[PDB]
């Protein structure tokens, strides 16, 4: 079903955001894992998987709307070197991504692509949940100190 | 069954205490939650629920005794800005409420409303249990230091 | 995550509405219960519980957006003296609340806070379901007469 | 298998009756439901479903006999404005349809289409069961009065 | 609850679209069945059922909003004579309907009927899923040829 | 444990191959899905997942050996436009990847990194299995013709 | 089956390494246990058991190849006096052992004793897993501090 050209462009831009997040979160997860921070590995790895699910939704929607998914261009990753820097990088990435989503959601509404909009709002809802988690962790590092914080990550939280 | 007017006035005063506590504990709970202090959220939230149950008992008793439950007047909340201030505020609230409960229990006995008294003694027993928990938590903050204390709250206890 | 100030003000206004409904529905329920109208107590009590859930959603959303939930100011309750007056009062409360919600949902859209909007639309949907029930019960009082209507409430509808 | 042309015309006429009943009973059901008359909604909705099953049998039979099912022409609905008027309209509809069925069954026998006849007699048996329920309900409205009658519909009849 | 008059008119127009689709899909289904194309009968029949569910939602919403559901006027059916023509007819119907849905969704938003809007968006999401299926099947007819396509329909897919 | 620098360079090169395959196979998969070729979607999607697992093994091994995983550089994808072209592109990618693996396996042996070698041989064994599947499917397209081949993909194989 | 004499000498040397590790890890384990460091006792004890399993494989392989297993000569143990020193001693022991293993694996290949080689690669894979754990724990001591580190060992991890 032929979709709006600019909606398809937005979907490819958002897909682009997801491809960056997938790689950044996956590497951060395994860096966490390599440092023995099992709890952070677990959360970060599942964020990575969650972004794959988002990318999948963008890809299928683009194909349905008869556009061409772009998995070729990969934006800049920002891999941190310590736990706080890594989480702060994820947070900045999520905030950038949420700005893009808001714009796309607004535009999709204006050209009456309510199904694309509905999908993006669900994804945005997922992203704000991740933003909440990040902000909380970043504050906890300051509140309990880095040594306690790292100690709180070495066992899985199940 | 027409009750003693002053007993009903006491029950409305105690109900008023409960209405303040319900709101104060519920907001403190979600503030804890927003900070990632899942254990404190869990306890604080269930205290709020417990105060709803106490309010319910007062409301039903007042109606049975043919009085008019007053849910319209809401006393002063004292919302804290950090964990210790919030727990100290809850404790002061509990101690004030216990003073009121003691007065009512004495008065109900004097006019032979033993069923109202029996109800209030159970509630007082619940409140001293809460007072015990608060005093213990406040002492632990001092004994293990705030950083260790916050760390001990980020996972649910169960 | 720093939210829009006017959205946060809307959320606090809506929270204020919920705090009124919680108390109004709770007292109405126990009045129904005190009269032996078990069916009405059951529905009314669970509406009270449902408004607590709505308040909870507003409170968590406000805290996330870094605003201050206001549980201190309690609006006017309108407690009825007979079944029809109580239900009509609940209905007026719901209709007033729905106007406020519609306005907030519109504005949330205009500043691209689609997650707050999504939350509020779910709540509005709950409220219109409650309005449907109220309108139905009020009509049934007139159609079967008050004596039959009351008789129909004295046993639980499981 | 090439059927009798006039038999096919009868089946299309009967299908036409079913299409009317489907819509009339479906709307009547949801009007009942909207008024809180759950028992009537339940029965009326299932009659609508049963008329769909009848329509289905006609459609399949017509196609087998190599005729063209007519779903395009929709006869007059008679939507009532109150419960008694709605049930009396359903009853008149059933009686008109039973007349049509009797004529078709007689003709089908006459041209030796015994399988179409057998199908139609099963449907006629279903309809007389519905006519029985309607006559009963209409009599009960008079015998117990409308207020009692409506009270008896507000709960599901297990 | 008195709704917006034009929203109600939209809902009746959409209900009208559904009434056409119910009949068109039901007849197409049984034509498929009569040809031995069991897989197409199964999908097409369940589309008809799905459109009945959509109609039900419109009817109940209209009644809640105190309007009058119109089940009397039936728009033009376009019954195909071979498989490709039938599927293309369904597809044109779905596309026409999606246009109406988009228009209604935009208008409901403008008068703050967010619950009617939310219902319609769910329905639009369903229809685009049906549009996807239709486009796929039509392409498969071209890609594998009609003889292979028909062979692929004669057993149930499950 | 500080690894051999050139081994780490090989692992990053092989990771790079995996990153291309992950994206190429995922897009091909959903293209198959969009075409209704359910069997091909299922296989292609699971190949994509298998390459993610391989990438995961490289990333963890690089980190253990104290190198820096490179997820930033993404090589050329070769997305096909029809089924045969897509499978041939996958096959060329796999053959290129196997050449790189053979080189790396030889080199790792020469510097006594037997654990890296052992890991790569397992991965090579997986890739040759995929190569077998691709070559088989490509031959089958020619042997049964494209129309029969496409028909054989529209149902899941399980 | 008469084996290569030099391979057998390698197997006896590696067996000697295992005999040192078995005793060193067992004593470190019970020293940990005596200090109340239950998590470390658990891991260290199971490493000792794993080295017994490795020794067992060497002994059986040596006897099969018709050599004489040497369990008489025991190399130098390096028992640490505090947790960090003990772990660093284990790590140095593992690294020395891996050097010997790589050499033996290389030589087994040159004389085509591929089964001895295959056994040794599995053991090497085990040892690098142990090296990973050791490096991680040593880094965690510095990152969270010894006091937090010790606190993190007093309960079993399972």
mmCIF file of C-alpha atoms in Angstrom, chain D residues 6-115:
data_model
loop_
_atom_site.group_PDB
_atom_site.id
_atom_site.type_symbol
_atom_site.label_atom_id
_atom_site.label_comp_id
_atom_site.label_asym_id
_atom_site.label_seq_id
_atom_site.Cartn_x
_atom_site.Cartn_y
_atom_site.Cartn_z
ATOM 1 C CA UNK D 6 -38.181 -21.197 -8.729
ATOM 2 C CA UNK D 7 -36.703 -23.089 -5.737
ATOM 3 C CA UNK D 8 -33.621 -20.855 -6.058
ATOM 4 C CA UNK D 9 -35.890 -17.799 -6.156
ATOM 5 C CA UNK D 10 -37.618 -19.004 -2.973
ATOM 6 C CA UNK D 11 -34.249 -19.517 -1.280
ATOM 7 C CA UNK D 12 -33.225 -15.979 -2.235
ATOM 8 C CA UNK D 13 -36.488 -14.641 -0.856
ATOM 9 C CA UNK D 14 -35.917 -16.538 2.384
ATOM 10 C CA UNK D 15 -32.310 -15.314 2.480
ATOM 11 C CA UNK D 16 -33.731 -11.796 2.095
ATOM 12 C CA UNK D 17 -35.917 -12.434 5.149
ATOM 13 C CA UNK D 18 -32.831 -13.602 7.075
ATOM 14 C CA UNK D 19 -30.780 -10.553 6.164
ATOM 15 C CA UNK D 20 -33.528 -8.348 7.610
ATOM 16 C CA UNK D 21 -33.820 -10.416 10.796
ATOM 17 C CA UNK D 22 -30.057 -10.437 11.301
ATOM 18 C CA UNK D 23 -29.905 -6.633 11.314
ATOM 19 C CA UNK D 24 -33.147 -6.079 13.185
ATOM 20 C CA UNK D 25 -32.262 -8.541 15.945
ATOM 21 C CA UNK D 26 -28.685 -7.290 16.189
ATOM 22 C CA UNK D 27 -29.707 -3.671 16.706
ATOM 23 C CA UNK D 28 -32.501 -4.662 19.104
ATOM 24 C CA UNK D 29 -29.937 -6.657 21.109
ATOM 25 C CA UNK D 30 -27.551 -3.749 21.513
ATOM 26 C CA UNK D 31 -30.389 -1.379 22.347
ATOM 27 C CA UNK D 32 -31.331 -3.844 25.123
ATOM 28 C CA UNK D 33 -27.669 -3.917 26.152
ATOM 29 C CA UNK D 34 -27.429 -0.129 26.140
ATOM 30 C CA UNK D 35 -30.468 -0.010 28.457
ATOM 31 C CA UNK D 36 -28.833 -2.481 30.858
ATOM 32 C CA UNK D 37 -31.224 -5.326 30.025
ATOM 33 C CA UNK D 38 -28.511 -8.005 29.924
ATOM 34 C CA UNK D 39 -30.812 -11.021 29.698
ATOM 35 C CA UNK D 40 -32.599 -9.594 26.661
ATOM 36 C CA UNK D 41 -29.312 -8.621 25.022
ATOM 37 C CA UNK D 42 -28.068 -12.182 25.492
ATOM 38 C CA UNK D 43 -31.139 -13.830 23.953
ATOM 39 C CA UNK D 44 -31.642 -11.271 21.175
ATOM 40 C CA UNK D 45 -27.979 -11.346 20.159
ATOM 41 C CA UNK D 46 -28.030 -15.136 19.895
ATOM 42 C CA UNK D 47 -31.157 -14.998 17.704
ATOM 43 C CA UNK D 48 -29.225 -12.708 15.366
ATOM 44 C CA UNK D 49 -26.400 -15.259 15.271
ATOM 45 C CA UNK D 50 -28.930 -18.015 14.586
ATOM 46 C CA UNK D 51 -30.362 -16.036 11.673
ATOM 47 C CA UNK D 52 -26.810 -15.689 10.313
ATOM 48 C CA UNK D 53 -26.516 -19.469 10.428
ATOM 49 C CA UNK D 54 -29.782 -19.743 8.491
ATOM 50 C CA UNK D 55 -28.576 -17.209 5.912
ATOM 51 C CA UNK D 56 -25.390 -19.235 5.551
ATOM 52 C CA UNK D 57 -27.353 -22.418 4.806
ATOM 53 C CA UNK D 58 -29.390 -20.593 2.140
ATOM 54 C CA UNK D 59 -26.275 -19.071 0.557
ATOM 55 C CA UNK D 60 -24.475 -22.412 0.390
ATOM 56 C CA UNK D 61 -27.572 -24.158 -0.945
ATOM 57 C CA UNK D 62 -28.128 -21.537 -3.660
ATOM 58 C CA UNK D 63 -24.488 -21.772 -4.773
ATOM 59 C CA UNK D 64 -24.647 -25.567 -4.875
ATOM 60 C CA UNK D 65 -27.793 -25.360 -7.017
ATOM 61 C CA UNK D 66 -25.843 -22.930 -9.248
ATOM 62 C CA UNK D 67 -27.945 -19.841 -8.530
ATOM 63 C CA UNK D 68 -26.773 -16.374 -7.483
ATOM 64 C CA UNK D 69 -27.239 -15.429 -3.823
ATOM 65 C CA UNK D 70 -28.722 -11.943 -3.449
ATOM 66 C CA UNK D 71 -27.224 -10.080 -0.486
ATOM 67 C CA UNK D 72 -27.705 -6.700 -2.139
ATOM 68 C CA UNK D 73 -31.396 -6.105 -1.518
ATOM 69 C CA UNK D 74 -32.334 -5.351 2.053
ATOM 70 C CA UNK D 75 -35.979 -5.276 3.040
ATOM 71 C CA UNK D 76 -37.616 -2.941 5.538
ATOM 72 C CA UNK D 77 -36.405 -3.111 9.140
ATOM 73 C CA UNK D 78 -38.893 -2.195 11.868
ATOM 74 C CA UNK D 79 -36.869 -1.012 14.848
ATOM 75 C CA UNK D 80 -39.003 -0.539 17.963
ATOM 76 C CA UNK D 81 -38.516 2.289 20.454
ATOM 77 C CA UNK D 82 -39.349 0.422 23.650
ATOM 78 C CA UNK D 83 -39.034 -3.207 24.750
ATOM 79 C CA UNK D 84 -42.609 -4.312 24.061
ATOM 80 C CA UNK D 85 -42.639 -2.599 20.663
ATOM 81 C CA UNK D 86 -39.307 -4.232 19.732
ATOM 82 C CA UNK D 87 -40.454 -7.730 20.724
ATOM 83 C CA UNK D 88 -43.786 -7.313 18.923
ATOM 84 C CA UNK D 89 -41.876 -6.221 15.802
ATOM 85 C CA UNK D 90 -39.658 -9.322 16.013
ATOM 86 C CA UNK D 91 -42.768 -11.452 16.425
ATOM 87 C CA UNK D 92 -44.467 -9.983 13.338
ATOM 88 C CA UNK D 93 -41.213 -10.529 11.423
ATOM 89 C CA UNK D 94 -41.041 -14.195 12.483
ATOM 90 C CA UNK D 95 -44.669 -14.837 11.564
ATOM 91 C CA UNK D 96 -44.194 -13.266 8.100
ATOM 92 C CA UNK D 97 -41.086 -15.384 7.558
ATOM 93 C CA UNK D 98 -42.873 -18.537 8.686
ATOM 94 C CA UNK D 99 -45.546 -17.891 6.034
ATOM 95 C CA UNK D 100 -42.859 -17.606 3.361
ATOM 96 C CA UNK D 101 -41.175 -20.788 4.590
ATOM 97 C CA UNK D 102 -44.394 -22.837 4.506
ATOM 98 C CA UNK D 103 -44.986 -21.820 0.893
ATOM 99 C CA UNK D 104 -41.415 -22.669 -0.134
ATOM 100 C CA UNK D 105 -41.468 -26.007 1.651
ATOM 101 C CA UNK D 106 -44.668 -26.957 -0.163
ATOM 102 C CA UNK D 107 -43.248 -25.945 -3.537
ATOM 103 C CA UNK D 108 -39.881 -27.675 -2.972
ATOM 104 C CA UNK D 109 -41.789 -30.891 -2.251
ATOM 105 C CA UNK D 110 -43.779 -30.467 -5.438
ATOM 106 C CA UNK D 111 -40.660 -30.343 -7.654
ATOM 107 C CA UNK D 112 -38.945 -33.090 -5.613
ATOM 108 C CA UNK D 113 -36.185 -30.973 -4.117
ATOM 109 C CA UNK D 114 -36.408 -32.935 -0.865
ATOM 110 C CA UNK D 115 -33.022 -31.806 0.449
#
